[PDB]
């Protein structure tokens, strides 16, 4: 037993039709790994786990990405001196399909370039009824997200207060509905928040 690691080399969010690798590694010399998703089309993947030096690993390829592939992934593994047997559940990893709707309008109210120690904040508008927006800082494993405020005149937005401008960078923003929590919108245009 003992839960293995489940991550995705490029990243969690996958653009429409692209592909991601969901690698399963573990020191515990297994021989078979099993991959499992949720959402609509609940499915399981049976791949023979190799042993690329020391630690045992498996490499699943989520091909032409689609609405069905996106959901909550979990990895398992074992040895076939006993077939059925499965390791303890592995860490949940949500595979997202970016690119599927009109791009939101990300911007910084105080300004993309703000003096340090001066609280910065970025909002996401759009004319469509997105129930929530997401903010990618590109890189980090777990990102942020918040439901949106009703139509103010014609728009739908969500404010992501970042706070005292410290070591800025570049954010992106997506939108989604209460129904399909894994099917996002097309990524909004990149923005460089500067800190002089």
UniProtKB/Swiss-Prot annotation:
The chain holds residues 26 to 221 of 348 of the full protein. It comes from Homo sapiens. The lineage of its organism: Eukaryota, Metazoa, Chordata, Craniata, Vertebrata. The gene is KIR2DL2. Belongs to the immunoglobulin superfamily. It is a single-pass type I membrane protein. This is Killer cell immunoglobulin-like receptor 2DL2. GO terms for cellular component: plasma membrane. Receptor on natural killer (NK) cells for HLA-Cw1, 3, 7, and 8 allotypes. Inhibits the activity of NK cells thus preventing cell lysis. Residues 17-82, 117-180 form the Ig-like C2-type domain. It is found in: Cell membrane. The keyword Transferase does not apply. Disulfide bonds join 24-75, 124-173. Keywords: Cell membrane, Disulfide bond, Glycoprotein, Immunoglobulin domain, Membrane, Receptor, Repeat, Signal, Transmembrane, Transmembrane helix. It comes from the Eukaryota.
């Amino acid at each position: 037993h003992r839960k293995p690691s489940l991550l995705a080399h490029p990243g969690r969010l996958v653009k429409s039709e692209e592909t991601v690798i969901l690698q399963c590694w573990s020191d515990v010399r297994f021989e078979h790994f099993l991959l499992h998703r949720e959402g609509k089309f609940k499915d399981t993947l049976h791949l023979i786990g190799e042993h690329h030096d020391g630690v045992s690993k498996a490499n699943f390829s989520i091909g032409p990405m689609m609405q069905d592939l996106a959901g909550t992934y979990r990895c398992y593994g074992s040895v076939t001196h006993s077939p059925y047997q499965l390791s303890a559940p592995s860490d949940p990893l949500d595979i997202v399909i970016t690119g599927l709707y009109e791009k939101p309008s990300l911007s910084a109210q105080p300004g993309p370039t703000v003096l340090a120690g001066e609280s910065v904040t970025l909002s996401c508008s759009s004319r469509s009824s997105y129930d929530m927006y997401h903010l990618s800082r590109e890189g980090e494993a777990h990102e942020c997200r918040f439901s949106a405020g009703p139509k103010v005149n014609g728009t739908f937005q969500a404010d992501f207060p970042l706070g005292p401008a410290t070591h800025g960078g570049t954010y992106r923003c997506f939108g989604s509905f209460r129904d399909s929590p894994y099917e996002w919108s097309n990524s909004s245009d990149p923005l460089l928040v500067s800190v002089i």
